[PDB]
Amino acid sequence: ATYTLTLDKLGPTVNPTTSDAVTFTATVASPDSTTAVFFTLDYGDGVTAETTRTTTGALSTTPTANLVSAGTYTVTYASIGTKFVTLRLYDSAVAPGVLLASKTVPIYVEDSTLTATLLQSGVPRLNLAFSGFKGRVSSSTANRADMWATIQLDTAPGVFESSRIFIGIAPTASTNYDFVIPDQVYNLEGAKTTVLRIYDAPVGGTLLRTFTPAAANAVYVVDPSKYVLTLTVGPTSVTTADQVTFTQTTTEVSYSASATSPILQWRFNWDDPSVVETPLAYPDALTAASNFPTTATAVSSAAASTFRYTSTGSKNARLRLYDGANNVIAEKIVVITVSNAGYTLALAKTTADPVTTDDTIAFSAGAKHLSSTSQVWWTIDYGAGESSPRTALTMTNVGAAAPNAIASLSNQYTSGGTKLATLRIYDRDGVGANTGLLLASTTVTFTVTPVLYALESAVEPFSPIATVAAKWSFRIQRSKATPAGVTESIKCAFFGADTGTAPADLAAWLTAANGAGGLTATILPSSIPSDIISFTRTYAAAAASLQGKLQCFIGSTPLWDPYYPTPVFQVLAAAPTYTLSASVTPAVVPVDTATLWTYNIIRSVPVPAGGPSLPILCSFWDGKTGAAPTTDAGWAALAGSANGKGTSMAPGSTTATCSFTPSYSTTGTATPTLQLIQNSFALDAATTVGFLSPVYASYTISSYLNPVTPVAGGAAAVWRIVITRNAAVTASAKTLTCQMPDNGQGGSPADVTADIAVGGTTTVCVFSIAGYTTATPGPYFATVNVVDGAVTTSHITKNFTVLASGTTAPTYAVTSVVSPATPVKVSTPVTYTFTITRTTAVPAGGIPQPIICEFFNGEGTAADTVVAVMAPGETTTTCTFTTYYTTVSAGGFTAKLMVFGESATTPSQLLAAVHSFATPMVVAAAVVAVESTTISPNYNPTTPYTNIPTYFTFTLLRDPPVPPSASSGVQFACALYTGQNVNPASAPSAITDAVYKTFTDVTTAVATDANYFADQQLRVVTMAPGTGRVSCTFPTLYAAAGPFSPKFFVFEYASSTVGANALAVADTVTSLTSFTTQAAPTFITGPTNVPQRVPLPKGFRTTCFDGYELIFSNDNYTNGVRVAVDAYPYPVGQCRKCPGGTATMDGYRCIPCPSGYWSNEGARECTACPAGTIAKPAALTARAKYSIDPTTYHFVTHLAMGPESCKKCPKGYFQPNIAGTVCLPCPSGFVSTSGATGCTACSEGTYHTDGVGTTTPGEATSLDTTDTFGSIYPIIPNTCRQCPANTYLPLRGQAAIASMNLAAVSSATPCRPCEDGTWSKAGAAGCQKCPPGTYRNTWFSGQLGSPFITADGVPVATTLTELGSGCSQCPPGTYAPTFGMSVCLPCPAGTFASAPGATACQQCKPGTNSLMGDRTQQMALVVTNAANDFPALRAYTISGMVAGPAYAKPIVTGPDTNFFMAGKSETCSTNLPGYYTDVDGLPIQLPCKPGTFMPFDTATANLLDTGLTVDGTQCYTCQTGTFNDEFSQPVCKACWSGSFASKRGLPTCEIAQPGTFTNVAAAANATFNTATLIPTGLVKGAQAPTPCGMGYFQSSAETTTCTACAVGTYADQAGLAACKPCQPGRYQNSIGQRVCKPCDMGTYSRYGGELCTKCPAGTVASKTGSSQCTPCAAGFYANAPDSATSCRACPRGYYGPYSGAYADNLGDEFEGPRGCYKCPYDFFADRPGVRQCTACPPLDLGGGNLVEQCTEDLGSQRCKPCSLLSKPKTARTEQSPPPPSPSPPPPPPPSPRPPSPNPPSPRPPSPAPPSPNPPPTSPPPSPPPSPPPPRPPPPPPPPPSPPPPNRSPPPPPPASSAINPGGGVNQILSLMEDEDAEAAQEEQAIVDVDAEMQ
């Protein structure tokens, strides 16, 4: 009943077109029933076909195939449009039938002419707008209508068709029309079948065309999220240097969505604009239009790329896969970063000391990069420029190493400018003109010091005359040295001012230098170059000023800087002539003598300003050579040598000095040659300006002879002559010949030739004489000739005297002593004294023998030699030496002395043997010790610091053994142990000296030798000569704090190895006091400091200025006088003016000034006090309340406030110093006025005592000292007092020496009592002499005047004076004709000085002479004053007979008691009577000569004419009858009676000549009365012989009386010599009868006789007065016997026979005995004729007869014849005659004659010839020696040098922390205007400070 039907298109899948046609499938199912039914089909176009009904089979639920299987129901369609096909079922086939069911199906027929295509550009995206769609329509019809297209993305039922899109009309032709389809988001990420549908109408309508993917043109959706591509492109942090590598093989691209997917060619980005993005390309091993790989695959099979980035910036490398439009489905990106700051190069120079161009400048660099290192192109940059190839660098080190090996490049830089060496590394390439990148900068700059050239100038001629050429020479000198192996040539050009203008630029100078005009020179390398360059210039016209400029070029660089001006030289002008003047001293010169010459140079035109000085060489010729130079060249050569000298001309100076002093070999008449030269350097040419002409020895000899004494039988002596010249031998040695004249003994000694070595003024000649031994003692003179050079034959004579010692041989004795003796310390002074003696002592006057004594001490080698001249008086020579031992005794030492006779300028020995010392010297070792020990840095002296490296110093003293100045230096080794063991490990084993001295030698230590602070160290220190103290210095460093025991050892250091301990006893250590080291403090005790520019609020101030004192105070203080109070809230800095006393410099310290000054409140500095004042700081006390504004700082005890502080000195002190802080007293001799700068010198006479009583001296007042100064100044004097009466101070104010003790030491002023005889009118500068008449002496002053005119008899203390001189009048008896004498001498014997003021004595008068005392007093025997004996002063002692018969010579008896004729002060004592004076001036009165008498006065005269007187001057002679034969007698003795005196003036009486006599009554010498010493009672005697009377005779002389002549003699007449006897015939019989009576008649008398005598026997005188009795004749007889008158003849008859016949008269008358007789008888005579009686005549009778006759009686006259008258009668007597008388006897022999005289004695023997002369007094030995002079002491030595400071400051602490709070993190116009104001104020402050310091 119910049937279901389906009908579908069995034909093509696409919708049908016109030609294709269709087939259908229709199935019918009927679940309800299965019955056959007939189906019919109707199409959209019914005309085409009308199908008939056909049966069906079995229907049922299962579908059954029906309709078109192989039938022809298929119909083509012509029309285009939608058709409806209907399938209808009929139950029966008969028309119409029953229609069970019909079904309608619509089909769409498209157009074959229409063509539609769809194009997709890119690959679609999920979720993202993909709008890459286009549609192409190409209708075959010419005109196609409007059209509408719809796009259906998928055929799924969920997806719906899109809205209609109007593509366009498409009106013309069949060309393709393209329309854009809007965006559509695909959501599947799977394969899609996009369908394009075309409609004719917007709504419904026919279907025109469809387009389908058609086998792989399908839209494939791609999801961007499934895609992941890996890039892995090299490294990320690599820099621009490194090349990043794209490894395309490693990268993998995959979709990870489906196996089949569209392929997209990839494209990758550098993000670098320089290179474009890649061409879009497919992955590896793939073809175009192929499915994208489902697995990871490489983008390229064998591609690798290397890329470098251009700038250091971040880059994003992005890969992305493209298809269609450049729109990205997915991109994968990776980041890469780059930086440039990493790279760091460092360049250093190794050789150091950069001197600009000198040497080579060597530098080397290391460049480091941290990681990923690669090549960077490095450029080296000097002062300018960089290399073009730019070198090359390789990287082989990590960034840890700083210096990398880069090519050491070295360059030479030019000029003194800095270099600033720059190394720049440019990264990228650099060879192809592309710039690398700059990475480090990092420039090194080192500072250099260049070398500077020096130029010198000199011209010739030196001033250019017009039209005269000149040549300028320039000296070039370089600084330091030329580099080795480099030679430099200089081209120099000079332009003259006259020639042309100087070039403006450098190029012209260079061109001139390069030209032939320029000059080229060469420099020797590696030495100091001194080059000379010469240019010639000629001036057409002379110019006053020369200015030249020169330029030198070395290579391309000028030597002088172009900015600096070219050198300018001002080189004078006018070529003036020079004037030279000479002066010499002395005029003449001996041989080789120094002479002074000085020379003045004058220039007319002074040198102009701004120019070089003028050097001139003066040439001198000594004259030794022989020929002076005659040309300029020779003189110039002389000047260039040592002979010529140089001078420089001072600018603007015209006066020049040049002095010199030569030597001569021989004196000549020469003055040395001058030449003035000036020349260019190096002596190129010779030029002379001025010329000049010349302006016109001694020896000594000492000769000594050794031995002096000649020796008999011994060796001859040696005589040495030493000749000395004042002048040294200069050129050649001289030979002198010494000749000695012959002395007469041993012949003439030969001459001696002695040569003198060159340079010696002394020569010696030696002589020996053979006969000198026998030489006579006496003087010899020697003449020696001397020859030297031209001057020849000098004479020198030397004199000596040689004694004769005989055969004796002298000897010298040497003895040695030392006062100190034993023991002597080492190195101490010792004095030796040696006595040399000669006992015989033979030399006396002639030759002194000089001695040399040499001393030798025990040095042991096996020396202060000294010479002394032997004095010819003393034989002891005393040699004084010093030895100064410096070694130990080692058993003692001996001193030995040696004697040499040769002296001064030692061949022969004068001692036979050497003499050692008597006592061996004992030497004691030293006693040195360490005096003290001190440490310079220390808390206390005992303990040094802990951390500070303290220095230990030990002081050594050598005690009194001070080392001698003249000796070698002695050194000591001092070694210690500090006690610490921080150093050299273990402590020393023992204390013994052996280990300690070995220790370590640290005498010289380096700073960082590590033994500097050694605990055990030994040093060696040398004592200098002359110093005693030694310092041992040691450094010690203590590691830790603790006790330490320092030990110290001292040893003597000698001969390298140290000696034993210098201390006494072996192994003795000095142990310092053990100490504990104290903590080390840190504090710099340095000057006041200022920080830099600290911020402060306002008033607070870093520094105040010029005097103010900082006040950290809230007190407002503008300047320094406060103002406001409590001003600032928190305290701020201020500053006060300060008080008066102190002064301040800079803003810190109000320091009181030193003593001399004073200050005000706020001045900078204490002003200077005037000189005289004292400027003491005055009392300040302090502040008590302590809240008061302080007066000042507390320590300032006393202050001097203002000018009222300077206080002067009192009167008597001088203040020459300006300061005057205290006041020195006026010394002895200068007196101050006010507080004088200087005390004044007083005058001569005033001195130093107190003068309080005197008014207007200036002695210091109470207000002076007391009120103000207090107790700092006592009271002392200031005055001057004239030396009092007669005393004087001979100097100007040499003060009175005052002693403080008054009663004990009476001090004095130095002025004298003066000397005797001088007064001083109170004061003076000199004593005044006495006027004459007056005198003076120290011991006395006064008189004693006229003593004997006082009746007392004593002198008078006489006090009379002249006022105006005060000089005492000379005592009367004394005078002063003279001004000056101490005692005025008395009057001599024989004048008078009565008045006191004796101007002079006067001679005593003619009558009165002088004698001490008066006359009467002098003759006063008695005494009136028994005590004084004044009037018992007796002076006469006369010579006379005392009263009475007695006669006492010296009536006055005794030695004379008063004789002085001199000390005469009164009346001239009248004369002693024996004496007299005829004149005035007789000293001793003259006794009267013999014969005279001077009576005591005029009246008292014995025998005088009363007219004449004796006026005291006259001695009147004696009278007749007086005599006196002696002197000094008052009167003359009256003669005894025998002797008679007649003449006047008799010393004798005369003998009373015989015949006369004197009987005088009053005649005897005068009687001298004892009372008055005077004679008296003298009356003259008989004046005559007063002759004898007759009757009296005087034959005796000298008689008083006359005696009568005796009997028998007569005295005829007076005066007869003697009695004369009466002549014969006369007689006298009485005594005293002058007449002789004649004898009687007949009587005779003989000569003499008392009475006449009668005749004897027969004789008769026969006369009266007859003298003889004659015997009568024979024949005759006498008258009577014995008396007869006459004789007559006998009578007639008688005869007388005999003559003697006489008559007897008695008896027979006339008869006698011999008479007459008768004759007898016969005989007869008869006529008295004859005596013969005749015997008668016998008569004759007749003639014959004869008759005898006889006379009658006896005698008868007549005879008668015989016979007549009786013959017989004759009887008578007969007698006989008597015998005859005998003959007379013979005469006797005469008396024998007197004998001859016997010879007296021979003449007496002679008195002897003189006896010899006993020797005079003995010669005097020597006197004691003189004391020696002292030696001045030494001054102190200089102090040791200060030690150096420590080393730098120590390394700084690297600093850290912040000192901040809150804990932090964990770790314009007004502007510059105000800053310029700050700078200006700072500059003004600097200017003010600079003004302050100046």
How would you write 1294-1317 as a 3-class SS string? CCCECCCCCCCCCCECCCCCCCCC
* Experimental determination approach used: cryo-EM
Q: Tally the C-alpha atoms within 13 A of residue 1671's C-alpha that lie toward its C-beta.
A: 10
Confirm if 368 and 399 have CB atoms less than 8 A apart.
Answer: yes
Confirm if 23 and 74 have CB atoms less than 8 A apart.
Answer: yes
Q: Rounded to 5 degrees, what are φ and ψ at 1051?
A: -135, 150
Of 934, 931, 933, the residue nearest 957 (C-alpha):
931
Provide the 10 A C-beta neighbour count for residue 128: 13
The radius of gyration of the chain from alpha carbons, rounded to an integer in Å, stands at: 93
Of 630, 698, 706, 622, the residue nearest 665 (C-alpha):
622
Domain boundaries, the chain: 1-109, 119-221, 224-339, 454-570, 578-677, 697-804, 926-1076, 1097-1207, 1330-1487
Which residues fall within 8 angstroms of residue 891, CB to CB, at 6 or more apart? none
Considering the domain delimited by 1-109, tell me its CATH architecture: Sandwich (2.60)
SS3 809: coil
Provide the 10 A C-beta neighbour count for residue 1611: 27
Q: Which helix (H) or strand (E) holds 634?
A: helix 632-640
Q: Rounded to 5 degrees, what are φ and ψ at 40?
A: -130, 150
SS3 985: coil
DSSP state of 1769: G
Confirm if 510 and 497 have CB atoms less than 8 A apart.
Answer: no
Extended strands (E) in 1089-1154: 1109-1113, 1132-1136
Domain 1-109 and domain 697-804, same fold? Reply is yes
In sequence order, the β-bridge partners of residue 675 are 619
Q: Rounded to 5 degrees, what are φ and ψ at 1415?
A: -65, -60
Residue 941 sits at the vertex; the CA angle it makes with 940 and 946, to the nearest 5 degrees, is: 60
Q: Which helix (H) or strand (E) holds 1884?
A: helix 1869-1893
Instruction: Tell me how far apart the alpha carbons of residues 781 and 743 are, in angstroms, rounded to a whole number.
Output: 9
Q: Rounded to 5 degrees, what are φ and ψ at 1869?
A: -60, -50
As a residue count, the chain comes to 1894
Which pair of tokens denotes residue 530? 């001194």
Which residues precede gaps in the chain, with C-N > 2.5 A? 696, 862, 905, 1867
Query: Domain 697-804: which CATH class?
Result: mainly beta
Instruction: Tell me how far apart the alpha carbons of residues 1658 and 1679 are, in angstroms, rounded to a whole number.
Output: 9
Which residues fall within 8 angstroms of residue 103, CB to CB, at 6 or more apart? 5, 6, 7, 86, 87, 88
Instruction: Tell me how far apart the alpha carbons of residues 1843 and 1712 are, in angstroms, rounded to a whole number.
Output: 194
How far does Cα 719 stand from its chain's mean position?
46
CATH 1.10.3470, applies to 454-570: no
Q: Which helix (H) or strand (E) holds 581?
A: strand 578-585
The widest CA-to-CA distance across the chain, in whole angstroms, is 383
In sequence order, the β-bridge partners of residue 867 are 852
CA-CA-CA-CA torsion sign (955, 956, 961, 966): negative
Which pair of tokens denotes residue 660? 């010199």
DSSP state of 1886: H
Which residues fall within 8 angstroms of residue 1032, CB to CB, at 6 or more apart? 953, 954, 955, 956, 974, 1019, 1021
Confirm if 686 and 636 have CB atoms less than 8 A apart.
Answer: yes
Instruction: Tell me how far apart the alpha carbons of residues 1318 and 1337 are, in angstroms, rounded to a whole number.
Output: 8
CA-CA-CA-CA torsion sign (1237, 1238, 1242, 1246): positive
Q: String of b and e for 1339-1364 (b: at least 16 CB within 10 Å)?
A: eeeebebbbbbeeebebeebeeeeee
CATH 2.60.40, applies to 119-221: yes
Which residues fall within 8 angstroms of residue 1445, CB to CB, at 6 or more apart? none
Of 1181, 1184, 946, the residue nearest 1080 (C-alpha):
946
SS3 1135: strand
How far does Cα 288 stand from its chain's mean position?
120
DSSP state of 1330: P
Q: Tally the C-alpha atoms within 13 A of residue 1787's C-alpha that lie toward its C-beta.
A: 3
Domain 224-339: CATH superfamily is Immunoglobulins (2.60.40.10)
Confirm if 29 and 63 have CB atoms less than 8 A apart.
Answer: yes
Provide the 10 A C-beta neighbour count for residue 1593: 26
Provide the 10 A C-beta neighbour count for residue 142: 9
Provide the 10 A C-beta neighbour count for residue 374: 16
Of 601, 584, 590, the residue nearest 661 (C-alpha):
584
Q: Tally the C-alpha atoms within 13 A of residue 1084's C-alpha that lie toward its C-beta.
A: 6
Residue 709 sits at the vertex; the CA angle it makes with 707 and 711, to the nearest 5 degrees, is: 90
Beta 177-180 vs 133-137: how paired, if at all? antiparallel
How far does Cα 115 stand from its chain's mean position?
141
Q: 926-1076 has which CATH code?
A: 2.60.40
- Cα distances from 1652 to residues 1449, 1621, 1628, 1640, 1641, in angstroms, run 61, 13, 9, 8, 10
